[PDB]
UniProtKB/Swiss-Prot annotation:
Its main location: secreted. GO terms for cellular component: cytoplasm; endoplasmic reticulum; extracellular space. In the egg white and polymorphonuclear leukocytes. The active site is at E35, D52. Keywords: Allergen, Antimicrobial, Bacteriolytic enzyme, Disulfide bond, Glycosidase, Hydrolase, Secreted, Signal. Lysozyme C is capable of both hydrolysis and transglycosylation; it also shows a slight esterase activity. It acts rapidly on both peptide-substituted and unsubstituted peptidoglycan, and slowly on chitin oligosaccharides. Its EC number is 3.2.1.17. It is found in: Secreted. Disulfide bonds join C6-C127, C30-C115, C64-C80, C76-C94. This is Lysozyme C. One of its GO terms (molecular function) is beta-N-acetylglucosaminidase activity. It comes from the Eukaryota.
Length: 129
């Protein structure tokens, strides 16, 4: 499923991502925009052989299990395909584990490079929330 900007902000808000670990809702919505382009079925294979999954492009090496990434941990204890659901619940739960880890949202490159320091609130401008 491809989300609307505001449809997503709302879903993320009810799922408790708004202001989670200090990161206001705009940050999350933007990260979503540039990681996956609001598309839940997005996948990207990396050079190290791992693959990134879903709305927030979560990586097979540390966080889930796709059965083809050697030496992986599965720190969110899910199959990696569960992150491609139109229900964003698993993506969201696993995002909270990642963000709480140590590097905050810097764990996401697209955020770090395309959102960090920007007026991220533009991303929730004019949504019923």
């Amino acid at each position: 499923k491809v989300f609307g900007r505001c449809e997503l902000a709302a879903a993320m808000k009810r799922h408790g991502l708004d202001n989670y670990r200090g990161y206001s809702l705009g940050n999350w919505v933007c990260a979503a925009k540039f990681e996956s382009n609001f598309n839940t079925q997005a996948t990207n294979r990396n050079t190290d052989g791992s693959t990134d999954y879903g709305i927030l492009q979560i990586n097979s090496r540390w966080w889930c299990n796709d059965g083809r990434t050697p030496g992986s941990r599965n720190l969110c204890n899910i199959p990696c395909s569960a992150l491609l659901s139109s229900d964003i619940t698993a993506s969201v739960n696993c995002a909270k584990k990642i963000v709480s880890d140590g590097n905050g949202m810097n764990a996401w490159v697209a955020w770090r490079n395309r959102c960090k320091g920007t007026d991220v609130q533009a991303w929730i401008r004019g949504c019923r929330l």
